[PDB]
Design a binder for this molecule. Structure first.
Ligand SMILES: [Cl-]
Length: 181
């Protein structure tokens, strides 16, 4: 969706978003995001993921993110030049373990994704850098963003396939807006 992603990135920039992330499986879509000024490129198969990280690295992308529920894959991504490691969280204790492991591998930017703000709060307490609210309902999203902010979160991302939710997240003060491509 080079056209439809370009649209959302441009509108979000006009609405005042300072950090826009684009997720896609096609490195050329991410390349188009990079040339458009997208801030974070999210690489959405392990060999294919590693090849995309190398391509984006050599294109000059400064913030390459990789998502996995397997810390071993995130470790491989870090060694090949990934910047932001996104821990896909569904159990609090497994999430806390992965954050510990990746920090000790030298990861300087660890993100945790969940639709449960309580998991995100546990990641915040543990030192997770970016909390990704996985949003389905606009009012639920708004309450989670406020809770995490008041609990001290300083980088809150919102991901949604609903454009209406991304717009409202930005209005509410969400720090990073994640566009699907
Ligand atoms: Cl994500």
């Amino acid at each position: 969706d080079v056209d439809e992603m370009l649209k959302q990135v441009e509108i979000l920039r006009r609405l005042g978003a300072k950090q826009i992330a684009v997720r896609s499986d096609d490195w050329r879509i991410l390349q188009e995001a990079l040339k458009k000024g997208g801030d974070i490129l999210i690489v959405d198969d392990v060999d294919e993921m590693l090849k995309q990280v190398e391509i984006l690295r050599r294109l000059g992308a400064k913030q390459i993110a990789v998502r996995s529920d397997d810390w071993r894959i995130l470790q491989e991504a870090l060694k090949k030049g990934g910047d932001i490691l996104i821990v896909d969280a569904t159990d609090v204790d497994e999430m806390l373990k992965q954050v510990e492991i990746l920090r000790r591998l030298g990861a300087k930017q660890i993100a945790v994704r969940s639709d449960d703000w309580r998991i995100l709060q546990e990641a915040l307490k543990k030192g997770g850098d970016i909390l990704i609210v996985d949003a389905t309902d606009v009012d639920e999203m708004l309450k989670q963003v406020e809770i995490l902010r008041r609990l001290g979160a300083k980088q809150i991302a919102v991901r949604s396939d609903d454009w209406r939710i991304l717009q409202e997240a930005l209005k509410k003060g969400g720090d990073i807006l994640i566009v699907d491509a």
